[PDB]
Copies of this chain bind each other. A is one copy, B any other.
Amino acid sequence: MLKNLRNEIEWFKNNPDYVYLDSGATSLKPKSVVDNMVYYCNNVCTNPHNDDSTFAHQAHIVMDDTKNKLSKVLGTKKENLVFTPNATYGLNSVAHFLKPFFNKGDEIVLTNAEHASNILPWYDIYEQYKAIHQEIKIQYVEVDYQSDNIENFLKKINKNTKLVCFANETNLIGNSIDAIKLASEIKKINPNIFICVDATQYMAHNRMNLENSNIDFVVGSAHKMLGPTGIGFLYISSDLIKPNIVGGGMNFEIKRNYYSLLSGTAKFEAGTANIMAIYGWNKALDYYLDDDLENAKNKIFELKKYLDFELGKIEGIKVLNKGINAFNSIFIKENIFSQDFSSYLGNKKIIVRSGLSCAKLANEILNLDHVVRVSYHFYTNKSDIDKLIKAVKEF
């Protein structure tokens, strides 16, 4: 239950003089997560490449329940999900999967509010292709943070476009885009365009329906979904299911100068899987199958308004994502760099983040190379926000 999340996160009990507002970098972890990871290391501790004993089969069921729960959350099937190390690692696999399908003159429409992991994996195909004397070009959507950013997207898609890589919820600015709506419009311009979404922020707060979505790839991580570090997901449309990583747990038959891929989604999951993280995410995907998801998203939306309004009455404070229903608040203090103001908040025991937060192209939206990001999750309460306002006022 998301309502008693604060009462289940033991972080708040051991560090009760601290205020956590860097939830958009990593999330605090409930007790059920840490305990299920302990149960693996001390009660199971087996490889998922073993099925002889029923002891070894225990881990296999937890993997499928985690994949079934993610299937319910992303609105798809467990036969479409691949366990990736992070989202940066799933986005690099998509780049290395769609690299050979590019031609000269094909375009990649990105955005100025994208993470460095929805930007740099596609620069690499760009510089690689220029060297092989083909030439792809990259188109950058200029974001209005107060818009749906649909026409600002469709104005950059032509008949040469091959990949539309965007993010459902951005990390720094916090604006949200409809993936299904934008995908349908891109598929009415050309139904042969690939669409990859970076839902590492979106899936930390919401759920999706990726069945019949015209989205070919969706990525995300677990350390932002109230889960552990070292595991993420990768959704591949039923048609597209070539493995980027090659090794164990991927082959059907290995001979000399020849090998076969396994049948299913196991061909992309190469090597031993992070079962400890699979155990922790099994207990974290139960908070995302709650009915108070929207009511705990609107509690955060209400706390965003309250901080933004109150910071707007504090002298020398301009909130740059004011007016949108988001899960972060980027603001600047006049004549003070965000690095120094975040250190002031840090000595006041308020953990925030400074800078563009790996969205190093968003200086064209804010006209600033630095911001203070006050990130929220479902466990954020009014007391947390109140103490931030107090510290800002005591500057």
Contacts and interface: CB of A to CB of B under 8 A. Distances in A.
Nearest to A361: B254
A209 interface: no
A342 to B, nearest CB: 4
A26 B271 CA distance: 12
B254 A120 contact: yes
Contacts of A86: 271-272
A271 B41 CA distance: 25
Nearest to A52: B342
Interface string A249-290: 111011111110000000000111111110000000000000
A201 interface: no
A230 B41 contact: no
Contact of A272 (B10, B25, B96): B25
B276 A120 contact: no
Contact of A26 (B46, B117, B223): B46
B248 A116 contact: yes
Given A254-B116, A259-B120, A275-B229, A353 B28 contact: no
Given A138-B256, A254-B361, A272-B25, A55 B18 contact: yes
A147 interface: no
Given A89-B245, A254-B360, A42 B271 contact: no
Nearest to A27: B45
A282 to B, nearest CB: 15
A301 interface: no
Given A45-B28, A52-B354, A120-B259, A85 B38 contact: no
Interface stretch (A121-129, A159-167, A317-325, A327-335): A121-129
A140 interface: yes
Given A88-B271, A231-B230, A45 B18 contact: no
Interface stretch (A29-37, A60-68, A188-196): A29-37
A42 B34 contact: yes
List of 4 A-B pairs having minimum Cβ-Cβ separation, nearest first: A230-B230, A117-B247, A53-B346, A88-B271
